Design a protein around this motif. Structure first.
Motif, PDB file in Angstrom:
ATOM      1  N   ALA A 195       2.335  35.289 -29.843  1.00 34.61           N
ATOM      2  CA  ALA A 195       2.247  36.040 -31.087  1.00 34.61           C
ATOM      3  C   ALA A 195       3.636  36.336 -31.642  1.00 34.61           C
ATOM      4  CB  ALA A 195       1.482  37.335 -30.863  1.00 34.61           C
ATOM      5  N   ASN A 196       4.664  35.957 -30.889  1.00 30.57           N
ATOM      6  CA  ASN A 196       6.038  36.255 -31.261  1.00 30.57           C
ATOM      7  C   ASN A 196       6.872  34.984 -31.352  1.00 30.57           C
ATOM      8  OD1 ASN A 196       8.720  37.043 -31.449  1.00 30.57           O
ATOM      9  ND2 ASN A 196       8.474  38.775 -30.043  1.00 30.57           N
ATOM     10  N   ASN A 197       7.184  34.568 -32.574  1.00 29.94           N
ATOM     11  CA  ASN A 197       8.031  33.396 -32.774  1.00 29.94           C
ATOM     12  C   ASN A 197       9.384  33.778 -33.364  1.00 29.94           C
ATOM     13  OD1 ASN A 197       7.721  33.832 -35.514  1.00 29.94           O
ATOM     14  ND2 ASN A 197       6.163  32.235 -35.774  1.00 29.94           N
ATOM     15  N   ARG A 198       9.794  35.025 -33.143  1.00 32.36           N
ATOM     16  CA  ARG A 198      11.084  35.492 -33.640  1.00 32.36           C
ATOM     17  C   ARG A 198      12.236  34.775 -32.945  1.00 32.36           C
ATOM     18  NH1 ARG A 198      10.475  40.428 -36.561  1.00 32.36           N
ATOM     19  NH2 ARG A 198      12.753  40.646 -36.554  1.00 32.36           N
ATOM     20  N   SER A 199      13.349  34.632 -33.661  1.00 29.36           N
ATOM     21  CA  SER A 199      14.535  33.987 -33.118  1.00 29.36           C
ATOM     22  C   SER A 199      15.674  34.985 -32.927  1.00 29.36           C
ATOM     23  CB  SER A 199      14.991  32.859 -34.047  1.00 29.36           C
ATOM     24  OG  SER A 199      15.389  33.372 -35.305  1.00 29.36           O
ATOM     25  N   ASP A 200      15.474  36.222 -33.369  1.00 23.97           N
ATOM     26  CA  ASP A 200      16.487  37.251 -33.171  1.00 23.97           C
ATOM     27  C   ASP A 200      16.275  37.928 -31.821  1.00 23.97           C
ATOM     28  OD1 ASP A 200      14.336  38.938 -33.441  1.00 23.97           O
ATOM     29  OD2 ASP A 200      15.027  39.876 -35.302  1.00 23.97           O
ATOM     30  N   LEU A 236      -4.187  41.369 -19.715  1.00 27.45           N
ATOM     31  CA  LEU A 236      -4.980  40.147 -19.563  1.00 27.45           C
ATOM     32  C   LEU A 236      -6.081  39.950 -20.602  1.00 27.45           C
ATOM     33  CD1 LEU A 236      -5.266  40.066 -15.683  1.00 27.45           C
ATOM     34  CD2 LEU A 236      -3.547  39.009 -17.160  1.00 27.45           C
ATOM     35  N   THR A 237      -6.598  41.027 -21.176  1.00 28.80           N
ATOM     36  CA  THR A 237      -7.556  40.858 -22.258  1.00 28.80           C
ATOM     37  C   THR A 237      -6.788  40.363 -23.473  1.00 28.80           C
ATOM     38  OG1 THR A 237      -7.404  43.187 -22.962  1.00 28.80           O
ATOM     39  CG2 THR A 237      -9.163  42.602 -21.406  1.00 28.80           C
ATOM     40  N   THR A 238      -7.506  39.791 -24.429  1.00 22.78           N
ATOM     41  CA  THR A 238      -6.875  39.212 -25.607  1.00 22.78           C
ATOM     42  C   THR A 238      -7.592  39.666 -26.866  1.00 22.78           C
ATOM     43  OG1 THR A 238      -8.245  37.239 -25.321  1.00 22.78           O
ATOM     44  CG2 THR A 238      -6.002  37.171 -24.432  1.00 22.78           C
ATOM     45  N   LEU A 239      -7.951  40.942 -26.910  1.00 18.45           N
ATOM     46  CA  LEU A 239      -8.617  41.489 -28.079  1.00 18.45           C
ATOM     47  C   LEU A 239      -7.688  41.370 -29.285  1.00 18.45           C
ATOM     48  CD1 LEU A 239     -11.071  42.787 -29.269  1.00 18.45           C
ATOM     49  CD2 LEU A 239     -10.218  45.027 -28.559  1.00 18.45           C
ATOM     50  N   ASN A 240      -8.215  40.805 -30.367  1.00 20.64           N
ATOM     51  CA  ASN A 240      -7.462  40.586 -31.600  1.00 20.64           C
ATOM     52  C   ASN A 240      -6.427  39.467 -31.499  1.00 20.64           C
ATOM     53  OD1 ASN A 240      -8.861  42.686 -33.040  1.00 20.64           O
ATOM     54  ND2 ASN A 240      -7.662  44.142 -31.823  1.00 20.64           N
ATOM     55  N   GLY A 241      -6.483  38.708 -30.410  1.00 21.40           N
ATOM     56  CA  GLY A 241      -5.862  37.396 -30.375  1.00 21.40           C
ATOM     57  C   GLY A 241      -4.363  37.297 -30.161  1.00 21.40           C
ATOM     58  N   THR A 242      -3.788  38.181 -29.354  1.00 22.19           N
ATOM     59  CA  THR A 242      -2.428  37.951 -28.880  1.00 22.19           C
ATOM     60  C   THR A 242      -2.486  37.427 -27.455  1.00 22.19           C
ATOM     61  OG1 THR A 242      -2.031  40.204 -28.041  1.00 22.19           O
ATOM     62  CG2 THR A 242      -1.474  39.759 -30.353  1.00 22.19           C
ATOM     63  N   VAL A 243      -1.778  36.330 -27.222  1.00 21.34           N
ATOM     64  CA  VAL A 243      -1.776  35.681 -25.925  1.00 21.34           C
ATOM     65  C   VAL A 243      -0.352  35.561 -25.416  1.00 21.34           C
ATOM     66  CG1 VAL A 243      -2.375  33.604 -24.645  1.00 21.34           C
ATOM     67  CG2 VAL A 243      -3.816  34.359 -26.551  1.00 21.34           C
ATOM     68  N   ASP A 244      -0.169  35.831 -24.129  1.00 21.78           N
ATOM     69  CA  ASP A 244       1.112  35.624 -23.475  1.00 21.78           C
ATOM     70  C   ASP A 244       1.008  34.431 -22.532  1.00 21.78           C
ATOM     71  OD1 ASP A 244       3.860  36.504 -22.982  1.00 21.78           O
ATOM     72  OD2 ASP A 244       3.155  36.944 -20.955  1.00 21.78           O
TER      73      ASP A 244
END
Ligand SMILES: Cc1cc2nc3c(=O)[nH]c(=O)nc-3n(C[C@H](O)[C@H](O)[C@H](O)COP(=O)(O)O)c2cc1C
Ligand SMILES: Oc1ccc(Cl)cc1
Ligand SMILES: Oc1ccc(Cl)cc1
Ligand SMILES: Oc1ccc(Cl)cc1
Length: 364
Positions: A195-200, A236-244
């Motif tokens: 969910a995080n594609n930041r480059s900073d 571990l849950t992914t409610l609202n669709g953030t995945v690590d």
């Protein structure tokens, strides 16, 4: 159930038992103004035999809101509304923390004053819907909008809003606050790699992905003291669709980071509806070492599993969400093995006292 009914110290508080009423969005906030109200005060007070109550998510600003009719904690009216809730609860002899909420990309402009949602990145939560009541169209679920990536200034502002929300919580008479860093909401959108594609400095590395969490918590602690700050994670849950990519590692690190802040408790959400991933005991054991404060778990616990988690040394307190909805006297039922009423999904959100304050206490 013996350990479950042992008291526990939570910072300056001495709680009556190890049972938590975890945050449960009921979307009953008075309109307009999204104000915590009388039926909510009754509702929470009914459940004040819990050792600790954590309020439903309460948005820290106008642009932090994700769903219609959730209570805010930033206007004077909202603070006053929460105050009546906390007084009602405190009258019963119970502790209550406010769950500070920023939904980030999990919202719709109609819920946030026509603004665009904010997030770590410009990634939309795919297939995710929020509920809208914009006054014109018939209230209902709509797809979330595409967020814009937070600037350094946005980050400073949101941290400011969290900090102020914490002060507002204390002004509303809460005993503490819980940072909602779970279920794919704003902070979760920084933490989870996909969910995080930041480059900073707020994206990429694990350390960077945790930076926003670090800085928000620093602010919260600075504002009201670490002994009044808890944090909720959902590794571990992914409610609202953030995945690590590596949640076990990410969240053990996060636990260690939060431990450095000496936050008073860490709250782990293990299950979300039917999203009930196997949570390895070894993971739980690692969390127990990474974080040395009060450890709270919620997710499909019953009396037996709760007691065992405590006696196994994995948990200090256990939250019961759905059972607390339908059983205001849940602790008494758990202790006696009285049958638990089941909640009506149809009245979980919105409406009035029906399905909120009219679940009776147990009567043989
Ligand atoms: C109606 C409902 C509302 C919820 N609202 C919140 C919320 O506001 N904040 C949060 O962190 N978790 C929220 N949750 C998750 C619960 O706090 C809890 O972690 C979850 O229901 C699993 O516990 P349980 O199996 O005992 O119900 C909610 C769950 C339900 C069923
Ligand atoms: O805030 C909410 C959330 C769900 C529903 Cl059905 C209504 C309002
Ligand atoms: O500061 C306040 C305000 C209202 C109440 Cl009931 C208690 C304390
Ligand atoms: O974290 C959350 C927030 C709201 C709801 Cl309904 C469920 C889980």
């Amino acid at each position: 159930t013996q350990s479950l009914f042992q008291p526990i110290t939570l910072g300056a508080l001495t709680l009556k038992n190890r049972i938590v009423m975890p945050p449960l969005t009921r979307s009953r906030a008075s309109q307009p103004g999204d104000v915590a109200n009388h039926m909510m005060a009754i509702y929470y007070a009914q459940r004040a035999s819990a050792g600790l109550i954590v309020s439903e998510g309460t948005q820290i600003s106008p642009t932090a809101k994700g769903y219609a009719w959730t209570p805010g904690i930033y206007t004077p009216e909202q603070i006053a509304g929460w105050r009546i809730v906390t007084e009602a609860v405190h009258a019963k002899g119970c502790a209550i923390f406010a769950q500070l909420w920023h939904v980030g990309r999990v919202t719709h402009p109609d819920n946030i004053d026509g603004q665009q949602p904010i997030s770590s990145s410009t990634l939309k939560a795919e297939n995710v819907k929020v509920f809208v009541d914009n006054g014109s169209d018939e209230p209902g679920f709509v797809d979330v909008a595409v967020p814009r990536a937070m600037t350094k200034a946005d980050i400073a502002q949101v941290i400011a809003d969290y900090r102020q929300a914490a002060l507002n919580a204390m002004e509303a008479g809460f005993d503490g606050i819980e940072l909602h860093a779970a279920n794919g909401y704003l902070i979760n959108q920084f933490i989870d790699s996909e969910a995080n594609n930041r480059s900073d400095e707020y994206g990429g590395s694990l350390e960077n992905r945790l930076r926003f969490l670090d800085e928000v918590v620093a602010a919260l602690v600075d504002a009201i003291g670490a002994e009044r700050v808890g944090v909720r994670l959902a590794p571990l849950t992914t409610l609202n669709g953030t995945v690590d990519a590596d949640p076990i590692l990410t969240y053990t690190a996060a636990a260690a980071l939060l431990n450095k802040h000496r936050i008073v408790y860490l709250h782990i959400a293990e299950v979300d509806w039917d999203d009930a991933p196997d949570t390895p005991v070894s993971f739980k054991r690692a969390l127990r070492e990474a974080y040395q404060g009060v450890l709270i778990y919620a997710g499909r616990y019953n009396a037996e599993k709760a007691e065992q988690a405590i006696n196994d040394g994995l948990a200090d307190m256990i939250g019961f969400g759905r059972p607390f909805i339908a059983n205001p006297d849940l602790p008494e039922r758990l202790r006696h093995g009285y049958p638990l009423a089941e909640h009506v999904p149809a009245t979980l959100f919105g409406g009035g006292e029906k399905g909120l304050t009219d679940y009776p206490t147990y009567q043989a």
